[PDB]
Amino acid sequence: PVVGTGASLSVELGPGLLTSIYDGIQRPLEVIREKTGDFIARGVTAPALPRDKKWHFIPKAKVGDKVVGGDIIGEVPETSIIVHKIMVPPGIEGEIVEIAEEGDYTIEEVIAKVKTPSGEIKELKMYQRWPVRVKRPYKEKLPPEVPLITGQRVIDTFFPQAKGGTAAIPGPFGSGKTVTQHQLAKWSDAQVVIYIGCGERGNEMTDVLEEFPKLKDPKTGKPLMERTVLIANTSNMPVAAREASIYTGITIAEYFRDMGYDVALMADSTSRWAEALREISGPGEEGYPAYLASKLAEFYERAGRVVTLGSDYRVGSVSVIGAVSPPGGDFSEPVVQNTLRVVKVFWALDADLARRRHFPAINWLTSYSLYVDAVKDWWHKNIDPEWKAMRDKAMALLQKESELQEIVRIVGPDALPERERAILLVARMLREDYLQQDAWDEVDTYCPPEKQVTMMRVLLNFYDKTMEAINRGVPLEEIAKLPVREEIGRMKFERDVSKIRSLIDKTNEQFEELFKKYG
Q1: Residue 442, CA distances (Å) to 212, 362, 408, 471, 500 in order
Q2: Which residue spans traverse the membrane?
């Protein structure tokens, strides 16, 4: 229902992308013009990558080296965090005949010449151009297998994102109702963040214009912008550029994955229109809803972990987290349905949970991840052989709690058996001691994989001992008051995993005494 491609719409890709703040068409901040329709339009002002800046170029190749598209011919330290890798653009191959020496150069300088097989000489710069609407090529899209570690317990355990995977999360990123969205940006083990911030004037002038060039990258000490590219998506810009933005972003992200980096693309969305600008502008025309659904599907299809172009075996990824914000908070709308149809992960940020101050406000019954089986082996091999068994078991606990609560909604709690009360006690411990995480605490703001599984073992072991105890006639009141219980509640604030781990033996001992006091 749109039978056409484009009219030359591209991005520049080379040193100077980091720290930059662009609009939907890679044009720097405060530069204001128009665009419309299916093909190109007009412009005048700004250049994408700084033309005056001097970048330090370390050569990686020597005259006589055979190269191919994607081969790394030099290094440029772009920020204190990120070394930029200079790449033979895709579709170019041959022998290096001319290569720059260790030196300082602007991005327009030729740093290499490549004699193609037929004899043609090609001139290479530190940057390249790429049409945002064609996916940058690669050798092989690898199947989902390694998780993107966010350090958020509820996500990493129950609703994992794979590196190169696709995830959706409710509402605008700028919501002050939740901080998980920000945790994702700063703690995910992607080296580079491509952020598409969509900010509507009101309670937010923009998606904090100044706090971002001041927000700390907690992994290094330097600011997050030194490993970030910000694309702004505001109301004061043409709706055509807003539309183009996620293609600008993902192309840039693909470019970084091509270097061997893991990249996280976060695409913000707003309660703006949906039904406006559709079938009829405002049948007569033709059926149309389906078409843009597949346009969005193809965009999400551009996420992935790849073997990159190049002579060396090299892997990079683009992981996509897309915000979802339906016109009336309906979540039956088209925007939600279309997105949820292609994404493999949905993290159900939940108002009721936020109201109750259960943080990470992620609803553990309505969230999902189709990557669980895909990542289990990474967990089993590197972290804990029982990872998968332990999460399934914990989810079963939470499912059971849910069913029990529904019945208690109908008959009250008075006829609850000790067993059911025991399940509720441990499900409560799961919710409070594991699902909940303190984003504001210097220790609990991030939870290494190692600590995640140890915390889960402590809890599941308390569960086993509890059900055993109940099977031996130990009253639940005694168990509810076991001293270790209170220690288990505070383990998320412990930095030393071995002290956490020791809660296991301590749990075992306390229950043994309880077996001495009864049997």
Answers
A1: 20, 21, 38, 40, 17
A2: none
> What SS3 class is residue 316?
strand
Query: Which CATH code is given to the segment(s) 370-519?
Result: 1.10.1140.10
User: How determined?
Assistant: X-ray
Phi first, then psi: what are they for 320, rounded to 5°? -110, 120
How many Å apart are CA 15 and CA 111, to the nearest integer? 13
317 burial (CB, 10 Å; 0-12 / 13-18 / 19+) is buried
Q: What letter does residue 10 receive in the DSSP assignment?
A: E
- Helix (H) or strand (E) segment spanning residue 425: helix 418-430
Distance CA 247, CA 365 (A): 33
Q: With contact defined as beta carbons under 8 Å apart, do 492 and 444 qualify?
A: yes
Domain 1-52+128-369 matching CATH 3.40.50.300: the answer reads yes
> Residue 206: what residue type?
T
* Residue 245: both structure tokens together: 């933005």
> Residue with structure tokens 């306390």?
510
Domain ranges of the chain: 1-52+128-369, 53-127, 370-519
**Number of H helices and number of E strands within the chain?**
14, 22
CA 210 to chain centre: 23
User: In Å, how far are 29, 281, 403, 483, 486 from 516, measured between CA atoms?
Assistant: 71, 78, 34, 16, 22
Length of the chain (residues): 519
Is 246 in contact with 196 (CB distance < 8 Å)?
yes
Name the architecture of domain 53-127: Beta Barrel (2.40)
Indicate the resolution in Å.
2.6
d(CA 11, CA 132): 6
Cα separations in angstroms, 462 against 429, 492, 507: 10, 16, 7
